[PDB]
Design an enzyme around this catalytic site. Structure first.
Site, mmCIF file in Angstrom:
data_model
loop_
_atom_site.group_PDB
_atom_site.id
_atom_site.type_symbol
_atom_site.label_atom_id
_atom_site.label_comp_id
_atom_site.label_asym_id
_atom_site.label_seq_id
_atom_site.Cartn_x
_atom_site.Cartn_y
_atom_site.Cartn_z
ATOM 1 N N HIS A 1 41.975 -71.817 -23.970
ATOM 2 C CA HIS A 1 42.085 -72.624 -22.959
ATOM 3 C C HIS A 1 42.228 -73.951 -22.318
ATOM 4 O O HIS A 1 42.469 -74.687 -21.236
ATOM 5 C CB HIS A 1 40.581 -72.094 -21.649
ATOM 6 C CG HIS A 1 39.544 -70.759 -21.732
ATOM 7 N ND1 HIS A 1 40.769 -69.589 -21.390
ATOM 8 C CD2 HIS A 1 38.224 -70.438 -22.186
ATOM 9 C CE1 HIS A 1 39.518 -68.290 -21.662
ATOM 10 N NE2 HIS A 1 38.798 -69.334 -21.794
ATOM 11 N N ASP B 1 39.917 -67.050 -28.316
ATOM 12 C CA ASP B 1 40.194 -68.590 -27.263
ATOM 13 C C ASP B 1 40.492 -69.007 -28.633
ATOM 14 O O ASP B 1 39.345 -70.930 -29.207
ATOM 15 C CB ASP B 1 38.800 -69.217 -26.895
ATOM 16 C CG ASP B 1 38.626 -69.712 -25.861
ATOM 17 O OD1 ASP B 1 40.014 -70.746 -25.741
ATOM 18 O OD2 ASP B 1 38.088 -70.176 -25.376
ATOM 19 N N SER C 1 34.946 -78.932 -25.629
ATOM 20 C CA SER C 1 35.423 -77.289 -25.929
ATOM 21 C C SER C 1 36.772 -77.771 -27.082
ATOM 22 O O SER C 1 37.428 -78.441 -27.502
ATOM 23 C CB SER C 1 36.571 -76.673 -24.859
ATOM 24 O OG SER C 1 35.188 -76.716 -24.169
ATOM 25 N N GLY C 2 36.960 -76.727 -28.223
ATOM 26 C CA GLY C 2 37.913 -76.231 -28.997
ATOM 27 C C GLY C 2 37.873 -77.305 -30.086
ATOM 28 O O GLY C 2 38.103 -77.570 -31.764
#
Ligand SMILES: COC(=O)c1ccccc1CNC(=O)N1CCC[C@H]1C(=O)Nc1cccc(OC(F)(F)F)c1
Length: 228
Positions: free
Chosen positions: A41, A89, A183-184
Protein backbone atom coordinates in the site's frame (compact mmCIF):
# COMPACT_ATOMS: atom_id res chain seq x y z
CA UNK A 1 6.29 4.45 16.72
CA UNK A 2 4.11 5.17 19.76
CA UNK A 3 5.40 4.62 23.29
CA UNK A 4 8.90 3.78 22.11
CA UNK A 5 12.37 5.33 22.42
CA UNK A 6 15.01 6.81 20.09
CA UNK A 7 16.92 3.88 18.53
CA UNK A 8 20.71 3.51 18.96
CA UNK A 9 22.15 5.15 15.81
CA UNK A 10 23.06 2.56 13.11
CA UNK A 11 22.40 -0.44 15.45
CA UNK A 12 19.79 -1.77 12.91
CA UNK A 13 21.83 -1.60 9.65
CA UNK A 14 19.04 -3.26 7.69
CA UNK A 15 16.59 -0.38 8.33
CA UNK A 16 15.43 1.53 5.23
CA UNK A 17 13.41 4.71 4.78
CA UNK A 18 11.24 4.42 1.62
CA UNK A 19 10.85 7.96 0.32
CA UNK A 20 8.51 9.60 -2.13
CA UNK A 21 9.57 12.94 -3.65
CA UNK A 22 12.27 13.27 -0.98
CA UNK A 23 10.04 12.68 2.09
CA UNK A 24 9.86 9.61 4.32
CA UNK A 25 6.80 7.58 3.41
CA UNK A 26 7.29 4.02 4.75
CA UNK A 27 9.76 1.85 6.48
CA UNK A 28 11.55 -0.96 4.66
CA UNK A 29 14.11 -3.65 5.31
CA UNK A 30 17.24 -4.48 3.31
CA UNK A 31 16.89 -8.25 2.64
CA UNK A 32 19.55 -8.69 -0.04
CA UNK A 33 22.30 -6.50 -1.42
CA UNK A 34 20.02 -4.94 -4.06
CA UNK A 35 16.55 -5.45 -2.55
CA UNK A 36 14.43 -3.73 0.06
CA UNK A 37 11.21 -5.29 1.35
CA UNK A 38 8.33 -2.99 2.33
CA UNK A 39 4.46 -2.89 2.14
CA UNK A 40 2.47 -2.76 -1.07
CA UNK A 41 0.00 0.00 0.00
CA UNK A 42 3.06 2.27 0.34
CA UNK A 43 3.26 2.88 -3.34
CA UNK A 44 -0.49 3.33 -4.05
CA UNK A 45 -1.24 6.55 -6.03
CA UNK A 46 2.57 7.13 -5.99
CA UNK A 47 2.34 6.71 -9.82
CA UNK A 48 4.89 9.13 -11.41
CA UNK A 49 6.38 10.20 -8.04
CA UNK A 50 10.04 9.58 -7.37
CA UNK A 51 10.58 6.57 -5.08
CA UNK A 52 13.97 6.29 -3.41
CA UNK A 53 15.42 4.27 -0.53
CA UNK A 54 17.55 5.81 2.15
CA UNK A 55 20.01 3.33 3.73
CA UNK A 56 22.49 3.76 6.57
CA UNK A 57 20.42 6.49 8.20
CA UNK A 58 19.61 7.49 11.72
CA UNK A 59 18.56 11.10 11.13
CA UNK A 60 16.38 11.74 8.05
CA UNK A 61 17.74 15.29 7.69
CA UNK A 62 21.36 15.38 9.02
CA UNK A 63 24.54 14.34 7.13
CA UNK A 64 25.94 10.99 8.23
CA UNK A 65 28.92 9.20 6.57
CA UNK A 66 26.91 5.96 6.10
CA UNK A 67 23.76 7.64 4.64
CA UNK A 68 23.12 6.94 1.04
CA UNK A 69 20.04 7.54 -1.09
CA UNK A 70 19.40 4.94 -3.72
CA UNK A 71 17.20 5.21 -6.75
CA UNK A 72 14.80 2.31 -7.45
CA UNK A 73 15.09 0.33 -10.72
CA UNK A 74 11.88 -1.69 -10.16
CA UNK A 75 9.01 -1.63 -7.66
CA UNK A 76 7.38 -5.10 -7.43
CA UNK A 77 4.13 -5.25 -5.39
CA UNK A 78 2.79 -8.69 -4.52
CA UNK A 79 0.49 -9.68 -7.46
CA UNK A 80 -2.41 -10.59 -5.11
CA UNK A 81 -2.28 -7.29 -3.19
CA UNK A 82 -5.36 -5.02 -3.48
CA UNK A 83 -6.20 -1.47 -2.29
CA UNK A 84 -9.07 -2.51 0.00
CA UNK A 85 -7.44 -5.48 1.76
CA UNK A 86 -4.68 -6.14 4.27
CA UNK A 87 -3.66 -9.39 2.51
CA UNK A 88 -0.39 -10.01 0.61
CA UNK A 89 0.78 -6.53 1.63
CA UNK A 90 4.36 -6.80 0.45
CA UNK A 91 6.52 -4.79 -1.93
CA UNK A 92 10.00 -5.48 -3.21
CA UNK A 93 12.13 -2.57 -4.34
CA UNK A 94 15.16 -3.30 -6.51
CA UNK A 95 17.80 -0.65 -5.90
CA UNK A 96 19.62 1.11 -8.80
CA UNK A 97 22.76 -0.88 -7.79
CA UNK A 98 23.84 -3.19 -5.01
CA UNK A 99 24.08 -1.34 -1.72
CA UNK A 100 27.53 -0.47 -0.35
CA UNK A 101 27.71 -2.69 2.75
CA UNK A 102 29.41 -1.80 6.01
CA UNK A 103 28.78 -1.66 9.76
CA UNK A 104 25.78 0.65 9.17
CA UNK A 105 24.33 -1.02 6.01
CA UNK A 106 23.77 -4.78 6.02
CA UNK A 107 20.87 -7.06 4.96
CA UNK A 108 18.91 -8.79 7.71
CA UNK A 109 18.49 -12.61 7.68
CA UNK A 110 14.83 -13.41 7.13
CA UNK A 111 12.61 -16.30 8.18
CA UNK A 112 12.24 -19.06 5.59
CA UNK A 113 10.58 -21.76 7.84
CA UNK A 114 6.82 -21.32 7.83
CA UNK A 115 6.10 -21.79 11.55
CA UNK A 116 4.48 -19.22 13.84
CA UNK A 117 6.49 -17.11 16.24
CA UNK A 118 5.52 -18.22 19.76
CA UNK A 119 3.08 -15.92 21.62
CA UNK A 120 4.87 -13.67 24.09
CA UNK A 121 8.12 -13.57 22.09
CA UNK A 122 9.64 -10.11 22.39
CA UNK A 123 10.18 -8.60 18.94
CA UNK A 124 11.55 -5.27 17.85
CA UNK A 125 9.87 -2.83 15.44
CA UNK A 126 11.56 0.38 14.29
CA UNK A 127 10.48 3.31 12.20
CA UNK A 128 10.23 7.02 11.45
CA UNK A 129 6.43 6.99 11.81
CA UNK A 130 4.35 9.38 13.95
CA UNK A 131 5.05 9.46 17.67
CA UNK A 132 1.81 10.98 19.07
CA UNK A 133 -1.85 11.60 18.27
CA UNK A 134 -1.12 15.08 16.86
CA UNK A 135 1.05 13.42 14.19
CA UNK A 136 4.52 14.61 15.27
CA UNK A 137 7.18 13.07 12.94
CA UNK A 138 10.56 12.24 14.47
CA UNK A 139 13.76 13.19 12.68
CA UNK A 140 15.54 10.08 14.01
CA UNK A 141 14.76 6.38 14.05
CA UNK A 142 12.50 5.19 16.91
CA UNK A 143 11.86 1.67 18.13
CA UNK A 144 9.76 -0.39 20.51
CA UNK A 145 9.86 -3.97 21.85
CA UNK A 146 6.49 -5.68 21.51
CA UNK A 147 5.33 -9.16 22.56
CA UNK A 148 3.73 -11.38 19.90
CA UNK A 149 0.01 -11.90 20.45
CA UNK A 150 -1.51 -15.34 19.73
CA UNK A 151 -3.64 -15.37 16.57
CA UNK A 152 -6.83 -16.68 18.21
CA UNK A 153 -6.92 -13.68 20.65
CA UNK A 154 -6.10 -11.36 17.74
CA UNK A 155 -9.06 -12.79 15.82
CA UNK A 156 -11.68 -12.21 18.58
CA UNK A 157 -14.68 -10.00 17.68
CA UNK A 158 -13.35 -7.34 20.18
CA UNK A 159 -10.02 -7.31 18.30
CA UNK A 160 -9.59 -7.98 14.55
CA UNK A 161 -12.67 -10.22 14.20
CA UNK A 162 -11.37 -13.07 12.00
CA UNK A 163 -9.17 -10.96 9.65
CA UNK A 164 -5.90 -12.51 10.85
CA UNK A 165 -5.06 -15.29 8.42
CA UNK A 166 -2.23 -17.83 8.77
CA UNK A 167 -0.12 -15.43 6.65
CA UNK A 168 -0.44 -12.65 9.24
CA UNK A 169 0.73 -12.20 12.82
CA UNK A 170 -0.09 -9.82 15.67
CA UNK A 171 1.75 -8.01 18.38
CA UNK A 172 0.38 -6.29 21.46
CA UNK A 173 -0.54 -2.62 21.00
CA UNK A 174 -0.90 -1.52 24.68
CA UNK A 175 0.36 2.11 24.60
CA UNK A 176 3.43 0.78 22.66
CA UNK A 177 2.84 0.20 18.92
CA UNK A 178 3.75 0.83 15.31
CA UNK A 179 1.88 3.71 13.69
CA UNK A 180 1.41 5.77 10.48
CA UNK A 181 4.72 5.93 8.61
CA UNK A 182 6.02 2.71 10.22
CA UNK A 183 4.19 0.61 7.54
CA UNK A 184 6.64 -1.55 5.60
CA UNK A 185 9.14 -1.69 8.40
CA UNK A 186 10.55 -4.76 10.08
CA UNK A 187 9.33 -6.89 13.01
CA UNK A 188 12.54 -8.63 14.14
CA UNK A 189 12.53 -11.57 16.56
CA UNK A 190 15.79 -13.13 17.79
CA UNK A 191 17.78 -11.26 15.15
CA UNK A 192 15.73 -12.60 12.22
CA UNK A 193 13.07 -10.77 10.18
CA UNK A 194 9.66 -12.26 10.98
CA UNK A 195 7.16 -9.69 9.81
CA UNK A 196 6.56 -6.49 7.87
CA UNK A 197 4.28 -3.83 9.36
CA UNK A 198 1.03 -3.75 7.43
CA UNK A 199 0.01 -0.51 5.74
CA UNK A 200 -3.75 -0.42 6.33
CA UNK A 201 -5.03 2.48 8.44
CA UNK A 202 -5.46 1.46 12.08
CA UNK A 203 -5.67 3.13 15.48
CA UNK A 204 -2.26 3.12 17.34
CA UNK A 205 -1.50 2.20 20.92
CA UNK A 206 -4.99 0.84 21.69
CA UNK A 207 -4.69 -2.64 23.28
CA UNK A 208 -8.02 -3.66 21.66
CA UNK A 209 -6.61 -3.21 18.11
CA UNK A 210 -3.32 -5.17 17.95
CA UNK A 211 -0.59 -4.41 15.45
CA UNK A 212 -0.79 -6.55 12.30
CA UNK A 213 2.38 -7.76 10.51
CA UNK A 214 2.71 -9.83 7.32
CA UNK A 215 4.63 -13.05 7.97
CA UNK A 216 7.67 -13.11 5.64
CA UNK A 217 8.02 -16.90 5.93
CA UNK A 218 4.59 -17.22 4.36
CA UNK A 219 5.94 -15.40 1.25
CA UNK A 220 9.39 -17.04 0.97
CA UNK A 221 8.74 -18.45 -2.52
CA UNK A 222 7.42 -15.12 -3.85
CA UNK A 223 10.40 -13.16 -2.43
CA UNK A 224 12.71 -15.74 -4.10
CA UNK A 225 10.89 -15.54 -7.40
CA UNK A 226 11.16 -11.75 -7.63
CA UNK A 227 14.84 -11.64 -6.85
CA UNK A 228 15.45 -14.37 -9.47
C1 LIG B 1 1.00 0.46 11.58
O1 LIG B 1 0.38 1.47 10.75
C2 LIG B 1 -0.68 2.13 11.27
O2 LIG B 1 -1.14 1.78 12.35
C3 LIG B 1 -1.32 3.31 10.52
C4 LIG B 1 -2.17 4.16 11.26
C5 LIG B 1 -2.85 5.25 10.69
C6 LIG B 1 -2.66 5.55 9.33
C7 LIG B 1 -1.81 4.73 8.57
C8 LIG B 1 -1.16 3.61 9.15
C9 LIG B 1 -0.23 2.77 8.27
N1 LIG B 1 -0.16 3.13 6.86
C10 LIG B 1 0.85 3.89 6.38
O3 LIG B 1 1.72 4.35 7.13
N2 LIG B 1 0.92 4.13 5.04
C11 LIG B 1 -0.07 3.62 4.09
C12 LIG B 1 0.86 3.54 2.87
C13 LIG B 1 1.64 4.88 2.97
C14 LIG B 1 1.96 4.98 4.48
C15 LIG B 1 1.81 6.39 4.97
O4 LIG B 1 0.72 6.83 5.33
N3 LIG B 1 2.97 7.08 4.99
C16 LIG B 1 3.13 8.42 5.42
C17 LIG B 1 2.25 9.44 5.00
C18 LIG B 1 2.43 10.75 5.43
C19 LIG B 1 3.51 11.03 6.27
C20 LIG B 1 4.40 10.01 6.68
O5 LIG B 1 5.49 10.25 7.51
C21 LIG B 1 5.38 10.30 8.92
F1 LIG B 1 4.97 9.09 9.35
F2 LIG B 1 6.62 10.56 9.45
F3 LIG B 1 4.42 11.22 9.27
C22 LIG B 1 4.22 8.71 6.23
Amino acid sequence: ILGGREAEAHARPYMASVQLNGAHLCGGVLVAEQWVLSAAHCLEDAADGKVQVLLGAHSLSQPEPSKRLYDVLRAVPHPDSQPDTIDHDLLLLQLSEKATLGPAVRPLPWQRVDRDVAPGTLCDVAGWGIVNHAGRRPDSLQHVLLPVLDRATCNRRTHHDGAITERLMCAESNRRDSCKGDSGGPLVCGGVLEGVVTSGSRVCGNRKKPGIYTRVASYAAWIDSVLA
